[model samples]
Target: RSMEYFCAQVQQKDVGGRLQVGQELLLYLGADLEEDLGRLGKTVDALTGWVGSSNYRVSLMGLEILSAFVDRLSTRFKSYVAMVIVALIDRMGDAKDKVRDEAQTLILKLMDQVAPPMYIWEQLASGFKHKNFRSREGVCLCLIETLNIFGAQPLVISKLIPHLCILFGDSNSQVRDAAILAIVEIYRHVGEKVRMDLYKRGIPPARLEMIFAKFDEVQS
Candidate 1:
């Protein structure tokens, strides 16, 4: 009902109460949201803690609330921008599919709202070297979607291609799998230039077939 109440509730362990708080806050945060920047700021400031939940549903709810802040409040939402990126990145590879998908879609919204896409990409790519495979895959998948929507920018690709290409040697096949699809996704947008970039980065000939064949398969 109130920011102080919401802040206190964010610290509690009751899923039901937390969910209740998250849902209630969504009403105002997702709408006009600029009446009093101070109040809106405190509201989200208190609610940001919800994203840290180990529970998938709670995390998804928290992400939706944050997306509302971006979608509605937009330019004024930058106060939460840093933590928002961290929060979205935290869920980018959630164990639950819906949570992971929301994380991807929401971060795109975040990129569109308060900051440049390249800045968001830099924050996201931080997950690349994460100890967990799921986190890595989620980040790669997120990038794939970004490339699809925004197309490749040579400057951005130059910075990220090697980091992604090197994932082919990762111990987890699934991680490498996302990595393969990531390269293919780029190849789709950038065409032959990405192929040559991969060669310069020393991607093996056989893997080249695997990557390009995906390009061919998807084309015809």
Candidate 2:
């Protein structure tokens, strides 16, 4: 409750939009919580609201606060942390491409810090249905990265294979490249069976080379 009040005071200062303020808030929480374990849960809950808002500056500030929280803490709030990550990933489906792009970059950053969960694949697979092809391209790229990180999990691979194929034929060249990388990466792991399945599904041998060529241009 005391930490909540402190967070409320800090947030009310409009420092929610400033990195320094955010960093300071994180430091304060760390210092205070050293004296009180009961303050931890409330701090996490309060931080959640800051991230969920549409004010990108504020959210970015909150991310800074989180970075400090993560650095000083143990594995106490893994589930809460994961849920926040999932919310950030879900922003890839946001109507604005800038928001989507930032969300994708942020997802990559988070996954770099934490091993991705199967839920990332699930969300990306579902994200393809969103109307913005550019955002979908970003989502596909992030999805493929998630696949690379978690591909050994059967449930995640199952979700990745079929949706990835659809992206190969996507009109957006970015999406096309993202999808091709996904296919090639999967083939590298699962081998000829995946290639044969794709061929039977109508990915012609000639087109396969074209896909590789496109990936080379973009990924190079």
Candidate 3:
């Protein structure tokens, strides 16, 4: 019943013990382990709470166990809990830069696995508000990936464009790279759709040339 005991059980590999630990944690997560918001909120709270403590290793271990459990989850549950997972990624702002980066990486991986909606894009971009440069950059990478997946959607494009444009001049090379990559991918996908607007903005052909050249430099 204790967190430590349950964490240990989760790591157990014996057939029934694995199932039992999983079931208990899942139940603690609620019978709906899929969308039981209250259970999810509690589990994330419990897991993230240890992030600042000496027990963080154990805590991360526990979180990893939970992640593996969630990884096996069905699409039905994934869709239902998309917002919750997004919220978890959003909260990584309070963590250490390394922790924040890891959290952002996990968020991207989960989105790839679940193939969730544009919500991940918005949540990831919103993470740019963090004071830490690394967290902001990490979020930018995730945002670019999400854009590649859903960039053609008008709503997704609208939510992403402004934030990414702002990052183009970011002090961090990582952020700058992400912003450039996002521009290239989005422009390719939304070409004619955004071309007139881009042209109307008086972005000279020379500037467009500069953009691609800079992006190429980032790549090499």
Ranked candidates (lDDT, high to low): 1, 2, 3
Best by lDDT: 1
Per-residue alpha-carbon lDDT of candidate 3 for residues 22-52, written as tens digits (9 for 90 to 100)? 4566555442343555454454444443333
What is the model-wide C-alpha lDDT for candidate 3?
Answer: 0.55
lDDT per residue (tens digit) for residues 9-50 in model 2? 544646444455566676675665545555565565566556
CA-lDDT, candidates in order: 0.75, 0.60, 0.55
Instruction: List TM-score per model, in order.
Output: 0.82, 0.62, 0.59
Q: Which candidate comes out best when scored by TM-score?
A: 1
lDDT of 3 at 63: 48
Residues 79-171 of candidate 1 have per-residue lDDT tens digits of: 677777777777765678888788888888866777777877777777888776887888888778777777676238877888787788888
lDDT of 2 at 45: 58
The list of candidate 1 runs beyond 4 A from truth reads 1-16, 30-46, 153-155, 202-220
Total clashing pairs for each candidate: 0, 0, 0
Q: In model 1, how large is the Cα lDDT of residue 198?
A: 72
lDDT of model number 1: 0.75
Return the lDDT, model 3, position 177.
74
Candidate 1, 66: how far from true, in Å? Answer: 0.7
